[PDB]
Structure formats: structure tokens, C-alpha cells
């Protein structure tokens, strides 16, 4: 009941029923959560 009306609008922003923006992009990247995967960054960890 807190956030039932919160949705992605057609300008790819996230807004409630008051038309107030909650997120400028969904999940801050604009991607759906069902199509993302656990990946490893090969550049963060190794030494210089």
C-alpha cells in the first residue's frame, strides 16, 4: 500500500500517482531486473 502507484513513465522516469518523480531512471540505470546477470569486473581487482 505504500508504493502501489509507483511506475515507470514513458519518459523512462519513475513517478508516483502525484506525478512526482521518485527516480529519474529505474534502478538508476533504467533496466528491468529480470534480464541482468551476475558479472565480474576484470579491472577493479588486479594490481597495477
Amino acid at each position: 500500500k505504500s508504493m502501489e502507484s509507483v511506475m515507470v513513465k514513458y519518459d523512462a522516469t519513475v513517478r508516483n500517482s502525484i506525478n512526482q518523480v521518485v527516480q529519474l531512471r529505474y534502478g538508476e540505470d533504467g533496466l528491468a531486473g529480470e534480464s541482468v546477470e551476475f558479472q565480474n569486473l576484470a579491472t577493479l581487482k588486479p594490481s597495477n
Partner: protein, 97 residues
């Protein structure tokens, strides 16, 4: 990009959640086109660089040519572009993949 990553992840935890599984896609490309790893390749590294740049231009989350829109687009795809330039770099495409 490495310095930006080490700012973003102060702990060295490289396991992130990103849309396109680049390692599996490279493996799929190896299996589909019958890539022999023992042989020299016919892929110019400058084509790798320019292809990664054009692909990064294609992946658009925030539309618009405004500086605000350009900054929002660069921020929204920052992690994925870093992962793409890291995975699809010239040295790795020359040696490993």
C-alpha cells in the same frame, strides 16, 4: 575507468549485476563461428576500439543531445561501459578471446 571503479567500489568486490553477460556472449561467438584459439586472428584491434566506441554510442538510456541529457546518459551506462571497454578491449580480443 579503473580509478572510477575503485572510487565506486572501495571494497574490492568485482561481482556486479549487469545486463549483457559479455563472457558468455564471447563464448557463444567462439562456438558459433568455430574460432580456433591456436591460430592467429583476422580481427584488427583498431576495429575492436572503434566497434566498442560505436556500440557505446548505440546503447542509450537517456535520450537527448543536451549536456544534461549527455551527462545522465554517461552516468546511467557508466558501469556497463566500463565493463564493456574492459571485456572487449584490444589486448583481450587479441590474446584470450
Amino acid at each position: 575507468d579503473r580509478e572510477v571503479l575503485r572510487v565506486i567500489f572501495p571494497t574490492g568486490d568485482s561481482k556486479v549485476v549487469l545486463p549483457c553477460n559479455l563472457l558468455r556472449m564471447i563464448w557463444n561467438a567462439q562456438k558459433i563461428f568455430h574460432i580456433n584459439p591456436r591460430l592467429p586472428s583476422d580481427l584488427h584491434p583498431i576495429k575492436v576500439v572503434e566497434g566498442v566506441k560505436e556500440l557505446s554510442k548505440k546503447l542509450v538510456i537517456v535520450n537527448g543531445d543536451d549536456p544534461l541529457s549527455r551527462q545522465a546518459q554517461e552516468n546511467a551506462t557508466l558501469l556497463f561501459n566500463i565493463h564493456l571497454r574492459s571485456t572487449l578491449c584490444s589486448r583481450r580480443m587479441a590474446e584470450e578471446f
